[PDB]
Design an enzyme around this catalytic site. Structure first.
Site, PDB file in Angstrom:
ATOM      1  N   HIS A  54      21.259 -23.533 -42.877  1.00 46.85           N
ATOM      2  CA  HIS A  54      19.880 -23.215 -42.129  1.00 46.85           C
ATOM      3  C   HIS A  54      18.710 -24.472 -42.871  1.00 46.85           C
ATOM      4  CE1 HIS A  54      16.340 -20.515 -41.204  1.00 46.85           C
ATOM      5  NE2 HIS A  54      15.797 -21.495 -42.124  1.00 46.85           N
ATOM      6  N   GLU A  55      18.840 -24.609 -43.947  1.00 48.07           N
ATOM      7  CA  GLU A  55      18.078 -25.760 -44.592  1.00 48.07           C
ATOM      8  C   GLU A  55      18.547 -27.042 -44.005  1.00 48.07           C
ATOM      9  OE1 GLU A  55      15.402 -24.349 -45.405  1.00 48.07           O
ATOM     10  OE2 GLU A  55      16.619 -22.473 -46.222  1.00 48.07           O
ATOM     11  N   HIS A  80      17.233 -27.874 -40.507  1.00 54.32           N
ATOM     12  CA  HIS A  80      15.826 -27.733 -40.313  1.00 54.32           C
ATOM     13  C   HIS A  80      15.746 -29.557 -40.063  1.00 54.32           C
ATOM     14  CE1 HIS A  80      13.597 -24.368 -40.468  1.00 54.32           C
ATOM     15  NE2 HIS A  80      14.022 -23.847 -41.468  1.00 54.32           N
ATOM     16  N   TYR A 118       6.092 -26.448 -36.263  1.00 53.29           N
ATOM     17  CA  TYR A 118       6.482 -25.436 -36.988  1.00 53.29           C
ATOM     18  C   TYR A 118       5.432 -24.324 -36.770  1.00 53.29           C
ATOM     19  CZ  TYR A 118       9.363 -22.915 -40.540  1.00 53.29           C
ATOM     20  OH  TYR A 118      10.351 -21.940 -41.178  1.00 53.29           O
ATOM     21  N   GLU A 140      13.305 -22.189 -35.931  1.00 57.52           N
ATOM     22  CA  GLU A 140      13.604 -21.042 -37.075  1.00 57.52           C
ATOM     23  C   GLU A 140      14.938 -20.528 -36.579  1.00 57.52           C
ATOM     24  OE1 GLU A 140      13.624 -19.877 -40.308  1.00 57.52           O
ATOM     25  OE2 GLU A 140      12.519 -21.398 -40.473  1.00 57.52           O
ATOM     26  N   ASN A 197      34.128 -15.360 -44.910  1.00 59.80           N
ATOM     27  CA  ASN A 197      33.507 -13.739 -44.513  1.00 59.80           C
ATOM     28  C   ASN A 197      32.489 -14.154 -43.608  1.00 59.80           C
ATOM     29  OD1 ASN A 197      33.144 -11.039 -46.853  1.00 59.80           O
ATOM     30  ND2 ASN A 197      34.752 -12.722 -46.934  1.00 59.80           N
ATOM     31  N   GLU A 228      24.766 -12.017 -39.916  1.00 60.90           N
ATOM     32  CA  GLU A 228      23.679 -11.629 -40.712  1.00 60.90           C
ATOM     33  C   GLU A 228      23.534 -12.935 -41.381  1.00 60.90           C
ATOM     34  OE1 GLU A 228      22.997  -8.115 -41.048  1.00 60.90           O
ATOM     35  OE2 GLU A 228      23.741  -8.659 -39.057  1.00 60.90           O
ATOM     36  N   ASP A 260      23.231  -4.829 -47.016  1.00 57.20           N
ATOM     37  CA  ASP A 260      21.963  -5.485 -46.241  1.00 57.20           C
ATOM     38  C   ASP A 260      21.887  -7.230 -46.004  1.00 57.20           C
ATOM     39  OD1 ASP A 260      21.662  -6.124 -48.922  1.00 57.20           O
ATOM     40  OD2 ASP A 260      19.710  -5.498 -48.949  1.00 57.20           O
ATOM     41  N   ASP A 320       2.611 -16.114 -41.120  1.00 56.28           N
ATOM     42  CA  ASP A 320       3.813 -16.907 -40.949  1.00 56.28           C
ATOM     43  C   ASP A 320       3.829 -17.883 -39.865  1.00 56.28           C
ATOM     44  OD1 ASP A 320       6.977 -17.231 -41.438  1.00 56.28           O
ATOM     45  OD2 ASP A 320       7.483 -15.658 -40.008  1.00 56.28           O
ATOM     46  N   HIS A 365       8.991 -16.861 -38.471  1.00 48.39           N
ATOM     47  CA  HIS A 365      10.511 -15.908 -38.876  1.00 48.39           C
ATOM     48  C   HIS A 365      10.621 -14.620 -38.346  1.00 48.39           C
ATOM     49  CE1 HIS A 365       9.674 -19.166 -42.017  1.00 48.39           C
ATOM     50  NE2 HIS A 365      11.164 -19.106 -42.038  1.00 48.39           N
TER      51      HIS A 365
HETATM   52  C1  LIG Z   1      13.373 -16.223 -48.100  1.00 50.95           C
HETATM   53  C2  LIG Z   1      11.979 -15.724 -47.559  1.00 50.95           C
HETATM   54  C3  LIG Z   1      11.839 -14.323 -47.612  1.00 50.95           C
HETATM   55  C4  LIG Z   1      12.093 -15.808 -45.873  1.00 50.95           C
HETATM   56  C5  LIG Z   1      11.595 -17.190 -45.339  1.00 50.95           C
HETATM   57  C6  LIG Z   1      10.324 -17.715 -46.143  1.00 50.95           C
HETATM   58  C7  LIG Z   1       9.547 -18.737 -45.677  1.00 50.95           C
HETATM   59  O1  LIG Z   1      10.260 -19.753 -46.055  1.00 50.95           O
HETATM   60  C8  LIG Z   1      10.182 -21.193 -45.278  1.00 50.95           C
HETATM   61  C9  LIG Z   1      11.241 -22.136 -45.502  1.00 50.95           C
HETATM   62  P1  LIG Z   1      12.861 -21.921 -44.563  1.00 50.95           P
HETATM   63  O2  LIG Z   1      13.716 -23.098 -44.609  1.00 50.95           O
HETATM   64  O3  LIG Z   1      12.789 -21.352 -43.476  1.00 50.95           O
HETATM   65  N1  LIG Z   1      13.693 -21.044 -45.748  1.00 50.95           N
HETATM   66  C10 LIG Z   1      14.439 -19.631 -45.384  1.00 50.95           C
HETATM   67  C11 LIG Z   1      15.274 -19.244 -46.266  1.00 50.95           C
HETATM   68  C12 LIG Z   1      16.549 -18.121 -45.980  1.00 50.95           C
HETATM   69  C13 LIG Z   1      17.511 -18.633 -44.892  1.00 50.95           C
HETATM   70  C14 LIG Z   1      17.034 -17.431 -47.068  1.00 50.95           C
HETATM   71  C15 LIG Z   1      13.579 -18.272 -44.866  1.00 50.95           C
HETATM   72  O4  LIG Z   1      13.911 -17.662 -43.721  1.00 50.95           O
HETATM   73  N2  LIG Z   1      12.695 -18.130 -45.543  1.00 50.95           N
HETATM   74 CA   LIG Z   2      22.313  -7.092 -50.929  1.00 53.26          CA
HETATM   75 CA   LIG Z   3      25.815 -14.611 -42.994  1.00 55.78          CA
HETATM   76 CA   LIG Z   4      28.957 -13.741 -44.663  1.00 59.00          CA
HETATM   77 ZN   LIG Z   5      13.801 -21.918 -41.894  1.00 60.29          ZN
END
Ligand SMILES: CC(C)C[C@H]1CCOCCP(=O)([O-])N[C@@H](CC(C)C)C(=O)N1
Ligand SMILES: [Ca+2]
Ligand SMILES: [Ca+2]
Ligand SMILES: [Ca+2]
Ligand SMILES: [Zn+2]
Ligand SMILES: [Ca+2]
Length: 316
Positions: free
Chosen positions: A142-143, A146, A157, A166, A183, A187, A200, A226, A231
């Site tokens: 995901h990172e 971006h 953004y 996102e 796996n 999710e 979860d 946000d 998100h």
């Molecule tokens: C991890 C938090 C609870 C959810 C959001 C927080 C704001 O983060 C911004 C940076 P990002 O690259 O969108 N980080 C994402 C991390 C997840 C995939 C664990 C995210 O959704 N962060």
């Molecule tokens: Ca868990």
């Molecule tokens: Ca997954």
């Molecule tokens: Ca998985």
């Molecule tokens: Zn993100």
């Protein structure tokens, strides 16, 4: 660093053993010379100054617990680089083999991961809400995605473009998770989220509403938190993407699934050829349709499924 390429072995956050590409020059460093201009992992030593120090180890074995998050960030970035290259013919995030850098052990008890415009950063989690974030391949991908989006469509953004940004990251992070056959599921973050609770995850693409995110345009969030809910509203696109792939009836609209591979080809093309920084959901739909059209023909089933999926989430 300049040195000899080699291979070390360690254990990741989840306790699994893996080999990783290192470079030897007095110490063994987490520097992988086999991919593009290199993948480099750094120790931020619980501080917030970045990138920190290139990870150095004395004996090329990474079994210490402080080593875990680095092992995974380094290994998962290589897998992600492999997906893009192998699957989409794209060399690194900029398409010209730019070095991929990540820092781990960022800050103390930091429950997040992010791309800061130049590199990836992973917190270790506070141990209740999360464990070190680089242990989830969907989070690493995901990172890095971006970065891909910033070099391509450049989606701003905030508001609808930001939610597209996102969703793109969740969709390709999930596709990379299936690519690696680790796996896989639909999710997000399941492997590093709430270690104490089984079952979860942070977000769900198959049923975003399970966690309270919207699964239909009529339910989008219109407030300011946000960045305008990037998100939250990504849930609507994630659901569309899941339906294109898997099929289903949602809100009474039936969609026939066309599979993950096609989903990826279509979204990658939309992203790299048609989306722009300010694109909105309605423009994402036109982009996706055009992409499917380009690839499979306007009278294809593929095109038909992309239309049904958007109609099902209410995006015209
Ligand atoms: C991890 C938090 C609870 C959810 C959001 C927080 C704001 O983060 C911004 C940076 P990002 O690259 O969108 N980080 C994402 C991390 C997840 C995939 C664990 C995210 O959704 N962060
Ligand atoms: Ca868990
Ligand atoms: Ca997954
Ligand atoms: Ca998985
Ligand atoms: Zn993100
Ligand atoms: Ca060691």
């Amino acid at each position: 660093i300049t040195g000899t390429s080699t291979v070390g072995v360690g254990r990741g956050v989840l306790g699994d053993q893996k080999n990783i590409n290192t470079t030897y020059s007095t110490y063994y460093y987490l520097q992988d010379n086999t991919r593009g201009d290199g993948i480099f992992t750094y120790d931020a030593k619980y501080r917030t100054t970045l990138p920190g120090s290139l990870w150095a180890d004395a004996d090329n074995q990474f079994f210490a617990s402080y080593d875990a998050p680095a092992v995974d960030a380094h290994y998962y970035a290589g897998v992600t680089y492999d997906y893009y290259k192998n699957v989409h013919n794209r060399l690194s995030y900029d398409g010209n083999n730019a070095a991929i850098r990540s820092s781990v052990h960022y800050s103390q008890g930091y429950n997040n991961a992010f791309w800061n415009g130049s590199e990836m950063v992973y917190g270790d989690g506070d141990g209740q809400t999360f464990i070190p974030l680089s242990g989830g391949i969907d989070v690493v991908a995901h990172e890095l995605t971006h970065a891909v989006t910033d070099y391509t469509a450049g989606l701003i953004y905030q508001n609808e473009s930001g939610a597209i940004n996102e969703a793109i990251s969740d969709i390709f992070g999930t596709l990379v998770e299936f690519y690696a056959n680790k796996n896989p599921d639909w999710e997000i973050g399941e492997d590093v989220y709430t270690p104490g609770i089984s079952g979860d995850s942070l977000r769900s693409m198959s049923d975003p509403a399970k966690y309270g995110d919207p699964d239909h345009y009529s339910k989008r969030y219109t407030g300011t938190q946000d960045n305008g809910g990037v998100h939250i509203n990504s849930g609507i696109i994630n659901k569309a993407a899941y339906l294109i792939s898997q099929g289903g009836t949602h809100y009474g609209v039936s969609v026939v699934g066309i599979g993950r591979d096609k989903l990826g080809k279509i979204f990658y093309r939309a992203l790299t050829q048609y989306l722009t920084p300010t694109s909105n959901f309605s423009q994402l739909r036109a982009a996706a349709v055009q992409s499917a059209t380009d690839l499979y023909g306007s009278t294809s089933q593929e095109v038909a499924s992309v239309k049904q999926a958007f109609d099902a989430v209410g995006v015209k």
